[PDB]
Structures are given as C-alpha cells and as structure tokens.
C-alpha cells in the first residue's frame, strides 16, 4: 500500500524541530520520522508547514502525517488521529532569573489535571492568584494557550505565532511569564545562552495537556496509524526513543 509519505513538520520548536545553519530541518521528529518510517519499509520526506494551519493541511491532503511537538490533546483527537505516543512529558511555567515568583514554594511538584481533586484546584488558584499582574506570552493553538484560557481566564495572555518570539519577549522584557513542556524549557534553560530564564512551578500532566507527543494521521488512514503504532512500539521497546531523547533534550523522556 504505502511506499513514500511527506511528514510535516513546523521547523521553529527546537530541540523537536528546527533549522540548523544551512536551513536544513533538524531535531528529534526529524530523527524520529527517519527511524520510524526504516522500520516500516517506506521513504520519508519532510516538509515545513507553519505551526498555524498543519491540522487543515493533513486533512486537506498536502502530506501524509505531522511530527511537530504535537501533543495527543482531546481537541485535536475531535479532528485528526494520533499514533501510540512518542514521548511524555510535564508542562510547567518559564521566568527570568531575577523573578520573585521564583520565591513562589509548590505545594504539588506533579500536578495531574484528569480529575481535579479540591486540593489540586487551591494549588491551580494560588498560582492565577500570584499571577495577577503577571503578563503572560504562550504560542498561539497550544496546549499552552488552552490550559491559560480555561484555567487561569483572569491572567493577562498575550499569543505568538512561534515560541521563538515569545522567549525573545520574555528575554526583552515585554512578558513576565511563560509556559511550555518540560522537553521544551529544559534544554532551553540548559543552555549557558539562557542561565538568565528559570523554571518554576509544578509539573503538570493530563487534562487540556492531553496524553503525550504523538504523529497526526488523517482519522480515514488506520492502516497508517498501526504501521506507525508498530513502529513506535518497537522504538520505545529497542531504547531507540531514549538514546534520541537523551541526544537531543539531555534527558530520557520516552514513555
Ligand atoms: C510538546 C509540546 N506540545 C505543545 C506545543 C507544540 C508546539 N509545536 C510546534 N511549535 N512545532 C502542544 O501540543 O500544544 C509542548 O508542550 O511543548
């Protein structure tokens, strides 16, 4: 049946997908993508598409699946389908270095947000508390952007069209906050470019989140969706998803 898929990709979320010197897209779904489609007998191309628009355009027919950062989110899963996940991860918020909210003590280091118990709402609501006056950049059709308008509606957000402009901002000054995943802030605040942004917060998994990293298939393409399951299976089994993660975001995040 299959012989060749075109993989879409964004191409401005390192360490998953990004451009190296001479414009060449690179990261981990690049890594990924290759693997997975040598273990399921078939020729991988990757194509750039702009994170706004990559779900109209698999649906649309412009290629075959989206390795970008994706997160298996409820929303999402109303209009595409989604492979086995590819790698887990929690979310939590982003600051400069000299922030007072840095001082804010966390009473729930891993926040699971499925079936929001009393005491995991006060921990949300002391946070939208601390926030107030607090401005807010996340990346526009994100998890991100999601969690900030139901969760905390009272926080002043500000959305970008890539998370690079939103670091830019707050690395300028005109936001005060951010939040993205772990796999994301981690390597970004590892970098010595950056020992001027912190994490903080708790670790936030589930809910609006979703169920972890995975590729977008039309939902018509089952036949792709068990190839790829098979493949990921496989990958995670071999330690191939843990050697890549650990390659690429200094720690293993594979599931
Ligand atoms: C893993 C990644 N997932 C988010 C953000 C994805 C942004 N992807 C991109 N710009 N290519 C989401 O599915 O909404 C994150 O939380 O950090």
Redesign the pocket.
Known sequence: DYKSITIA??G??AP??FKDAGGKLIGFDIDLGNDLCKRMNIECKFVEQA?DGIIPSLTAGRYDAIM????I?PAREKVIAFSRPY?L?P?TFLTTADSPLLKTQVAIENLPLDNITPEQKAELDKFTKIFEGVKFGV?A????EAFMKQMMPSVQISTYD??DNVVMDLKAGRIDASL??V??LKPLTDKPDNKDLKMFGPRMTGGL??KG?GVGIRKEDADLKALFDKAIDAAIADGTVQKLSQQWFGYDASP
Do not use: C, D, P, R
């Open positions: 990709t964004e401005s979320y998953y997908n994170w970008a950062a994706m997160g989110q790698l991860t979310n990346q059709g994100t998890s991100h890539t998370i993205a995943s796999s994301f989140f979703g990293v």
